[PDB]
Structures are given as structure tokens and as C-alpha cells.
Design a protein around this ligand. Structure first.
Ligand SMILES: O=C(O)C[C@H](O[C@H]1O[C@H](CO)[C@@H](O)[C@H](O)[C@H]1NC(=O)NO)C(=O)O
Ligand SMILES: O=C(O)C[C@H](O[C@H]1O[C@H](CO)[C@@H](O)[C@H](O)[C@H]1NC(=O)NO)C(=O)O
Ligand SMILES: O=C(O)C[C@H](O[C@H]1O[C@H](CO)[C@@H](O)[C@H](O)[C@H]1NC(=O)NO)C(=O)O
Ligand SMILES: O=C(O)C[C@H](O[C@H]1O[C@H](CO)[C@@H](O)[C@H](O)[C@H]1NC(=O)NO)C(=O)O
Ligand SMILES: O=C(O)C[C@H](O[C@H]1O[C@H](CO)[C@@H](O)[C@H](O)[C@H]1NC(=O)NO)C(=O)O
Ligand SMILES: O=C(O)C[C@H](O[C@H]1O[C@H](CO)[C@@H](O)[C@H](O)[C@H]1NC(=O)NO)C(=O)O
Ligand SMILES: [Zn+2]
Ligand SMILES: [Zn+2]
Ligand SMILES: [Zn+2]
Ligand SMILES: [Zn+2]
Ligand SMILES: [Zn+2]
Ligand SMILES: [Zn+2]
Lengths: 231, 231, 231, 231, 231, 231
């Protein structure tokens, strides 16, 4: 029974969009699970096996309870029955209260393609007659949120991560192959000051909210507020 | 030091948009103040003096701590320096944490005109060199929300009012002259099943959120969520 | 030559979104046909064979002229050439003046997936060289509209159903397995006061329009008005 | 009891936005009245007295029943109580079923400023206690529409004017001082092929609708359709 | 190394949306390549072989350097890995600075389906580990623009084509089978004054910009302006 | 004949929104003039006379050719005929090719109120019969742009300021009273790391565009591009 299940297309997606929030939730003694849909086998830098090691270290730094690896294809997250079914299994295993996934308004098409698959899976996961690979019972997710990877958009709300910005930056620096040039690295948008740009975005959202750093989220489901109305 | 200050153009505006929420806040031992910008002197039904009595009874039913009467003109809420200054005084007296006002997308122009005046007043209230009628100190409101009177729009969030729907309906029935036909009443949009339409809207928003009844709100200021993310 | 062909993903979709409008059209002596894309085989309550009986009774209550059953998969309305072609056949058989389908902004992904298939089919149906399963001639639909199932959105227009609200409620009550708890029913969003929520929405749209009940529609095609400008 | 009352800021506004529609309505034996808010005294070409003659000829060409001249200031349509009251009088005299006014998304600020005044006047006109200059009874307008002058926007609906495009072009050519260069004319956006641009827009809207020419309109009030759903 | 690569679903798409711009670029001594995704085999008028001849003549009239023919299916531009890969090859062969494709808001679904495939291909083309059919190196497109075929929408920007409107009209008249009725033609939206409607749209966009004719474009990528800020 | 005239409500507005762009234009040997609508007499920090000195130093650092001081009231930028006329005079004196003003989506109401006045003034400035205080001839501004002060919104375009970011930061540091705490300063949103937040925003817009720093702008007038299409 995870409190949170956070999907990314590629390892490092969840950390870029909400690593400060994961670190915050783990410190509140929530159970947080991370699921990567792909092994990022088309990444310009690194290898599949090195990337897995880096992702395991990022998850340990944040205190995530489990890292689940799916093997859908990098640049191949086409809508299909079989891809949805694989994700339904993960949802029904973790029985999360809240699912997070990438926001679709992003230069990388895998981010929106991942969100479309995860939305179909959340619905199918709650239908008892829908059969997954492991024949697991129906599960109804209560909260569904979207985090930003490449975007800088006006979010529906923010979460204060002022106390976990260092844990987020450590989790990102775990992906040395992705963000840090080396003798054999090639130039990508990620190797040219990208962690400083994520920090700049979280500083701007923090300013909107009167704190040092905040992460932005969307919800398509209606938000119901209680303690946070007057705070 | 009010926790909440709720503005309307006319008495009954605040009750239609958020009477369930006021009743909820008062039961949480919050201090709630209501301010009507006008005496509703152009109301097709009733009189100024009868309307004041009805508004005092609605405020008592909800447990609001004080009802403040301004005398800006009904159908005359033109943007002016002097109208903004009158509202700044109310803000600086009550020192509210949260201000509520009408959402502007409404068939009645006074509702959007009231919101425009209250937005200018919230900003001017925080400027120490800005002088109000009573020479009061600067006050910075922390939360600013918009409630719906005539509209049915998709809100930014809802508040569960399932436990205070009866208190809301009692507060509305206090405005007998506005909602209940009599020997000398004239037809208005308010005298033809209007309280049942408010209840229908709050039932539909409750369905979006998985509760019996909820009230809808907007915020232009960024929402920062904490306990309500996972709830 | 049907005047109207109304598509749903599942039987009861068309009734929830526009059963009052179908009943209204049949009373105007229009020929109305209903097509369900799926047999709803993953429905939490009931069976495929019981659901068909209920759908035949709903169609009889509304006076629809024919109910067409397709066998695309429940939770499997992926965009495909073969799924579009199956729908093109139905369009070319019925030669409707107006096609109705679900609005895509809906918690159930099959509703938007159904609309995407029906949009592709309407275009392909008008292309003479496009071959359907029954080798039927090209047909150009004149009007294309979207109805709301789970949503409450601001529509492009409404239709007064004040005189057919009882026929709509009877058509919905025909789906006993879907809406009415029984000894062996499971909880769904449909078994917890859902017909009262549809009635509340149609009451709110009626208020916008000055009538008791109205159903909301969208059009992507430009509306051309004549008698209804001054009415 | 006019069927239609069409407001413009300046004479020629109503003709540019909806002269084909006025000509169509008059041929349907509707009573159409036109009201110009200003005498266009700051017009680069012509004079106040010449402009009035041209406006009287345009109204005669279209068959409008009366042309009402207000004297609010050109480039001075600031929101004021007294400007709203002057317009309320016109509404209460004509008792129109439908009011038309300029759409606000227009390079000329007087067009949106005129619409804002007319919206306030339509509401105040229906309030019996609101007193106009001539102490006239309350009047409730049923339909409220917006036409485009300088814009080319996607409208909410169109009206086929294929049969009245020549009457529209004659009404525009009545404003010789505005559209036709002369020995003493100065260059304006109106003197450089402007009637051909209005014709091009009405040709493009006609294409959207499958007719030769159509005029575009907006409505903020909900549209309720009946005969035009299936047409 | 093309300066420009313009994709259409069907030959004549690029000419309708941006033939004036292609003619303008060729006169500036830019290298312009055109790629048609389909052979338009379901076209109501003409044949595949006649259409190819007409497309070769249109390309010659505009001075395009090469016309590339893909064989994806007319009315079959479903998102697939293999369709994306075919387009990646064209991008990696031409190494364009700028890619143009259809805007998705269009009555013909192939136009949006083509844009979705081309967007996925532009991203995959820049990923070195992504393998195309011809094993070509990664290529990063710098500018990505959308042109309008059937639409008339408010664009993000326009390009003055006043000096190449005649070359555009000649390129369109090359498609005799598509636009000009004959003894054996059937009625389509294209055979009923369609070239005059394209000219009317370019006249309206020219008016917005103060020139005789202009073509409209969208960009999802951020525009960075320098010389055109002050022009 | 200024190339550029940039309006702010308060001195430091233009520098926050576009000081890098002004510095860039001056280095291109454009004539840039700055106009402040108010003397910022309600500023929590500093005095009117100190603020003028700081504004003169900021203008010198950027190389602006003239700084024009109007005396409209701080927190009193109500729409009025006389306020518009004062601004028309400045426009007709400077005869700018391009006018810049604040974007209206901003927590400070004076920023949107200033933009509304400047929009009315740009239109009235081009009307020869409209008389300003100095009886100056009509002037037609060619380009009209909006810059962001407090906002972080997705702009219509950016300008690369990578080479003038230091000049921008020097111009902002000239406003010591506004941004730098002192013995007698009070806390405002401007005294708590605000210049670092402006730099973070310009870093994020630079990332969208592939440069180090960029400033964001809006245009309501249609953009016509030529050299910047292919760049
Ligand atoms: O576009 C990028 O961000 C760089 C690009 O990396 C992104 O795209 C690759 C291809 O789908 C992925 O393998 C890689 O995981 C992805 N990175 C990513 O999304 N980080 O948030 C690269 O490796 O060239
Ligand atoms: O339009 C209506 O809702 C009816 C109308 O009442 C509204 O407008 C009047 C004129 O501004 C106001 O005096 C009256 O308070 C107002 N009612 C109202 O907004 N209730 O929420 C009436 O009395 O005729
Ligand atoms: O989510 C719901 O509305 C309940 C759900 O029913 C909807 O989803 C099922 C799975 O796709 C469908 O078989 C069923 O027809 C559908 N009902 C429906 O859309 N009614 O308008 C259920 O049976 O659990
Ligand atoms: O901007 C224009 O359309 C030209 C301009 O005419 C418009 O603006 C003037 C100043 O408000 C008005 O007197 C004139 O009536 C107005 N014309 C107009 O809106 N036609 O639809 C002019 O005379 O210079
Ligand atoms: O809808 C139309 O524009 C007419 C239609 O032509 C369009 O659709 C056909 C079917 O996909 C295509 O073969 C044909 O190329 C296409 N024309 C087109 O998009 N021109 O811009 C026809 O030939 O009937
Ligand atoms: O809200 C703020 O930015 C602080 C505030 O300063 C802004 O508001 C004051 C009142 O209108 C102005 O005098 C002051 O110029 C203004 N500053 C400003 O907009 N900087 O971009 C203050 O001095 O308290
Ligand atoms: Zn990724
Ligand atoms: Zn009210
Ligand atoms: Zn359904
Ligand atoms: Zn006008
Ligand atoms: Zn095409
Ligand atoms: Zn300012």
C-alpha cells in the first residue's frame, strides 16, 4: 500500500519534476514508489546498465521504498492495449493513494505519451473485470497529479520543497552520465547547465508562493481543499 | 484579526456563493466577518431596512462574527479612488488572513465590478504610505479567493460542505423578500426556484469530489498545498 | 435515411447525454438511430446479455427506430484502421443528417477514444474511394454534435428537454443493473445517486436558458443559425 | 417593440459587422432599430453633419425602421453612471427582443468600451427601481449578440447573408467620406480597400458554413437551439 | 542541407498553406524541399499518376529543389513506430534548418495526424541511438512551424507574400484535377471556388499586417526575435 | 523620432521587464526613451526625490536618450480622458516606431492599469482631430509590445540579452532604496532577493531559446516576420 507511486518515461524524469516532493513525503514517513516505463536505451550518454545503477542511487538518496523497472521501448510509447496492461499490474501491486506522472506539454514526446498510457492504466486498474498479467484485484487511485520535466508552465498548485532542495540536487547529481560532461560524452540539452535551470524554475515557483523553493503540479481531477484553504 | 473577510456586492451574495463554507469555518472556531459593499437599494423585492434585518439573521444563522455595511451605490460600483479607499478601511480594520469575493463571470455586472474594487483594495491595503479614511496601518492579506453567485463554472478547487448544507439553506431562507413570492412580490430570477438551483450546483461539485455537497472557488494567487496533497 | 445517429461507447452513454433530446426528436417525427461501439463486457455490474435487454428497453422507451450493436472492445477503443472502417459502415447504412457522440472531457477514457474514432469515420464515410466492409456509397453527414456523459462543462448550446425529462429518467431506469443496487451489485460511481446528478446538471443548464431542463452540446463545425437567432 | 436594436460606437460600425443580417431581418418583416453612441466627431475624413446624412442613407438602404443618435464623446466612452443611463433610455424606448453590439477584441478601443457600456445598460434596463432620464418601465432583453468590426475571429455562430451581400455593400458605399478617397481625404485603414476586406471575411465565414457569404457573431448568454439543430 | 523541408499529408497541402512563402524563400536563394507523406490514392478526383505529374509541376513553378514522395496510406496516418521511422529518414537526408507541417485544427484528420507523426520524427531524428532505415546520423532541426490548409485561425505570426501571390496561384492551378471541374469530376470542397477562398484568407492576414497578402504560421517552440522586433 | 518608447507605472518597471533589451537596442544605435507614468510617491522605501536620482542613474547605465516623468498618481491610474491625453502628448513628442508597456497579468494592479491607459493613448495619438495638451500632430506607432514585471508567463517571443545581462543588473542595482535593505528599510517583495528572481526568469527564457539569458514579450498586434523565420 504505497502512499505515492510516481511514474516517469525514463529514470531521472521523476527526480527532475518532483524529487524535492518525494524527499519531503519520505520525511513525513509516507511510502513512495518510483516506476520507470523504459530503460532509456536510446540515451545519447551512458548505457542501460550504468543508468540502472545511477537510478538506484537517486532512489536511495530520496528514500524511495522501491524502484520498479518496466521495459516499454524508449521512443516507442505508442498507445497499445498491452502497454496499458503492463502499467495496470504496477498500479494494482503498489495500491497507491496518489499517482504522479509527467505533464504532457514538453518538448520530449515520450513525456506526454507516458502520461496518456498512465491515465488509461489508472482507469483500467479500477475495473474488476479488466484482467492484468498477475490477475490482481481492482484498485482505485484517489489523487492523480502531473509534474513538469522540460516545461516552465503556470501550475495548478505548488509544494514547498525549501527543506529538501539539497536532497533533490543530490538525486540529480547521481545521474552523472546524463548531466555531467566526460571524455566520451556528447552534447545534449541535459549536459549544458540543466540542474541549474531546474533550480531556477523551483526558485521562481517558490517566489509565487513566498518560500525559497517549490515544485509545480497539475491536477485534471477536481482538487478538494480543507486545511490548506486557511493554512 | 478575522481569519476570513467575505465581500459581496449585495447581502445574500456571500451566502449563495459560500454560506456552507462560512458555517464550516465558524464550527472550526475561525472568526468570519462579512462585508456588503451596497445596501441593495435597487432590489426589485423588499426595502433597504427589511433587507438589513434579513442579512443580520442570515449572519446569525451562519455564526459570522460581524456584518459590515458599506454604502456604495447598487448598480454604481464604477472603479474610483474613493470606492477603493472605503474598502481599504474595512480590510485594515478586520486584518483578515483570507479575503473572499465574487467571481467576475456572472450575468450581474455588480459582481465583477465588486471583485475589481476589492482586488485594488487588497493591494492598496498593504501599502503603508496609502492612507485610508481611519489612518490605519498596512495589512497584507495572505489568501484571496473567488466564489460563484449566478455562475456554474469549473472551479479551481472545492470545499466539502456536506455537514453545513442545512445551515446554508437556512441562511438563504432568511432572505424571504428575495427568494419567496408574496402578495406584492415581482418575478425575478431569484423568486423562481433559485435556492434549489444553488443546491443542484453544490450537489454537482460534490460529485466531482466524491462528497454530497461542495462549494467551488477560484484563486488567482498561486495555491501552495501541503496536507491536502495526500489528505 | 436517419435524421439522427447517436454513438456511445457503452449502452446508457447516449441516454445519459441526450435521452431527453432523442425523445424530443422522435416526438417531432424524426428517425433516430443509436449505435453502441462496445458490448460493455467489462461493466462491474450485470452481464453482456442482460445489458443488451436493458438497452433494447431504453431504446423502445425513447422511441429510437433501431439500436446497432458493434463489438469493439470495452477499454480497447485504440485508434485503428479496422475500428474506423467498422464505424464507416454504420454511417453509410444510416445516412444520417446529424451524428452525435461523446464529448472527450470525461473521466472515462473510452468516451474520448470513441469520439476520436467517430470523427475519423465521419470524414472517411464521405470519401467515395474509401471502401467499407459492405462496399457502400459515400455519405456526407451535415451536423456533428458532442453530448456530455460524466462531465459538467459549459456547453456551446442547449436543447430544451423540459417536456421529455420523464422519458429520459424512464430510459435510464431501464438500466437497473447499472444504476440500482441489488444483492450482488458492487459499488460504482453509477450506483450512488447518479440519475439524480444527471437531473441536477439538466436543471442547471435549464436555468442558464430560462427553462426547467436542458441538455448541453458542443459543435466543432461552425453553427449556422436562422430561426433560433430571434426565436 | 423593436425585434432588434443594434448599437455601434460610430455610424458604419453596425453596417460593417452585420449590415447583411439587418437587411435579412427587415426582409423577414422584423423591426430593426440602429443606435450610434457617438457622432464620430474625431473621424479623420468628413464632418459630423455629412456623416449623419450618410448614416441616414445607409439605414434607408438596409430598411432599418429608426436611427437613434446619442452624443457620447468619440474616444471618450469611459465607463460612467451617466453614460449607462443614456443607453438604458434607448433600450427602454425600443423594448428590443435582441440587442447587438461590437465584439471587444478590436484594434479600436471605442468598440470594446461601447460593448462594456451596452452590457451595463442591458442589466440596468431590467431593474424597475433603476431610473432612466425618461422614467420608463423595466425591459428585459432576451437575446444579446456581438458582431465583428475590425476583427477576423472564430465566431460562436454565423448567419447566411448570401441573399443580402449586395444590400450590405450598398450600405457601406453610402459612407463615401469614410471608404472612398477624394481630393481632400487623408489615408486611414478605412480608405485602402476596406469594403473588399469585409467581403473577404464574410466569404471565409460562408465557406465554414457551406454558403457564399455569412456574418459571424458571439453570445455570452447561453444559446438555446431548436429548429437549427437539424435545420 | 536544405534550408527548409515542408511536409504535407497530400500533394497540394504545402502549396495551399505556404506556397507564397516557398516561392519567397527560393527567390532569397534558400534550398526548399517538399515531402508528401501519402500518394493521395483516395482523392475523389484524378489518379495517383496524374497527381504526381501535377505535384512535379507545382514544385517546378515554386522553384522547390526536390519533391520527396512517401507511401504512407491516405486516411491511414495512424501513429506507428514504422511510420515515424520513414519520416526520420527524410529529415536526416535533407538536414533542414526549418521544418513546416500542417496545423492540426483542420476538418481533415490526416492534417493533424501528419503533424503528430512529423513532431515524433523531428524528436527521434536528433537521437543518435535511434536508427532509421538508411542508418543516417542524428540531425537537430532548429525551427518548427505549422501552416494552415483548411483553417482560418488567428496565427502566431505572418510572412508577407505580396510579391509571390501570383506564383502561389500558379502552383495551385497546376492541380487541375483537384480544383477545376471537368466532364468526369465529382463535387468536393476543393472544386467549388477553393483557390479564391485561400486568396481571401491571405488578403485578411495581409490586412492584419499592413500588406496585400500574408500567410499565417504557428510555432510551439519559443520564437526568438532580433531584426524583426523593430524591422 | 525615437526608435523605442518604453512606459512603466513606476521607475524600475522598464528595467525589470526589459533593461537587457534597452541596453541591446542602444548598442545597435537605436534611440530609446523611457517614460514613468508616476513618481512612485507611495513606495514603502525611499522618497520621490531619491527615486528620481536612482532612475536617472539607471537610464544613464542603459544609455537611454531621455527619461520622461509624468505625474499621474501612484495607485491612482484609473481610466480617465485627462490621463490618456497626458500620455498622448508623450507619444506625439517622441514619435516612436515601437512602444513597450507592462503586461497586465501581474499582482500589482498599476501595471495592468498603466497598460490600459497606454493602449488608449496609442490609438488616440494616431487620430488627427484628437487634441493633446501641446497641439501636436497625429503619430502612428508601428509596433506595440508588453514586458513582464512581477509575472513569469509563457511569452509570445523572447529577445536574447545574453550580452547585456550585466548592464541590466547594474541598472537594477541603481535602485538601492528599492532592492537593498538599509537601517531604515521595510520589508517588501522587492527587498528579499528580487534581482536574483529576475535573473532566474531570464535564465529560464534563455533555455527555451538556446541562449544564456532572454527577456519575454507579448504582442496583441499581429507579428510579421521576415529575417527571423530562418535566422
Ligand atoms: O532531449 C533530451 O533531453 C536528451 C536526450 O535524452 C532524453 O531522450 C532520450 C531519448 O528518448 C532518453 O533515452 C533520455 O532518457 C531522455 N532524458 C530525459 O527525458 N531526461 O528527463 C538524449 O539522451 O539525447
Ligand atoms: O438579477 C437578479 O438577480 C434580480 C435582481 O437582484 C439583483 O440585482 C439588484 C440590482 O443590482 C440588487 O439590488 C439585488 O441585490 C441583486 N441580487 C443579487 O445579486 N443576489 O445575489 C432584482 O432585484 O431584480
Ligand atoms: O466508471 C464508471 O462509470 C463505472 C464503470 O462503468 C463504465 O466503465 C466500464 C468499463 O469501461 C463500462 O463497461 C461501463 O459501460 C461504463 N459505464 C458507462 O460509461 N456508463 O455511462 C463500471 O462498470 O465499473
Ligand atoms: O482607425 C480607423 O478605423 C480610422 C479612424 O476612424 C475610426 O476612429 C475614429 C476615432 O475614434 C472614429 O471617429 C471613426 O468613426 C472610426 N471609424 C470606425 O470605427 N469605423 O468602423 C479615423 O477616422 O482615422
Ligand atoms: O475533403 C477534401 O478536401 C476533398 C477530398 O480531398 C482530401 O481528402 C482525400 C482523402 O484523404 C485526399 O486524397 C486529398 O488529397 C485531400 N485533399 C487535400 O487535403 N487537399 O489539401 C476528396 O478528394 O474528396
Ligand atoms: O509590491 C511591491 O512590489 C512593493 C511596493 O512597490 C510597488 O508598489 C508601490 C505602490 O504602488 C510603488 O510606489 C512602487 O513603485 C512599486 N514598485 C514596483 O512596481 N516595482 O516594479 C512597495 O513599495 O511596498
Ligand atoms: Zn524523460
Ligand atoms: Zn448580488
Ligand atoms: Zn460509457
Ligand atoms: Zn467604429
Ligand atoms: Zn491534404
Ligand atoms: Zn511598478
Amino acid at each position: 500500500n504505497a502512499d505515492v507511486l510516481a511514474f516517469g518515461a525514463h529514470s531521472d524524469d521523476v527526480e527532475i519534476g518532483m524529487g524535492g516532493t518525494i524527499a519531503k513525503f519520505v520525511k513525513q514517513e509516507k511510502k513512495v514508489m518510483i516506476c520507470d516505463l523504459t530503460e532509456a536505451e536510446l540515451s545519447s550518454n551512458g548505457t542501460v546498465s550504468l543508468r540502472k545503477e545511477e537510478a538506484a542511487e537517486a532512489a536511495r538518496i530520496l528514500g524511495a521504498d522501491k524502484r520498479i523497472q518496466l521495459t516499454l521501448p524508449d521512443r516507442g510509447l505508442i498507445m497499445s492495449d498491452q502497454a496499458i496492461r503492463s502499467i495496470v499490474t504496477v498500479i494494482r501491486i503498489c495500491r497507491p493513494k496518489a499517482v504522479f506522472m509527467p505533464y504532457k506539454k514538453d518538448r520530449h514526446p515520450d513525456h506526454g505519451n507516458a502520461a496518456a498510457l498512465v491515465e488509461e492504466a489508472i482507469f483500467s486498474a479500477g475495473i474488476h473485470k479488466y484482467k492484468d498479467e498477475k490477475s490482481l484485484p481492482a484498485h482505485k487511485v484517489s489523487k492523480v497529479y502531473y509534474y513538469m520535466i522540460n516545461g516552465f508552465h503556470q501550475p495548478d498548485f505548488v509544494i514547498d520543497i525549501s527543506d529538501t532542495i539539497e536532497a533533490k540536487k543530490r538525486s540529480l547529481n547521481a545521474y552523472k552520465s546524463q548531466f555531467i560532461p566526460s571524455k566520451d560524452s556528447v552534447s545534449t540539452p541535459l549536459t549544458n547547465g540543466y540542474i541549474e535551470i531546474v533550480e531556477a524554475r523551483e526558485k521562481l515557483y517558490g517566489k509565487e508562493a513566498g518560500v525559497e523553493y517549490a515544485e509545480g503540479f497539475f491536477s485534471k481531477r477536481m482538487l478538494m481543499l480543507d486545511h490548506d484553504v486557511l493554512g
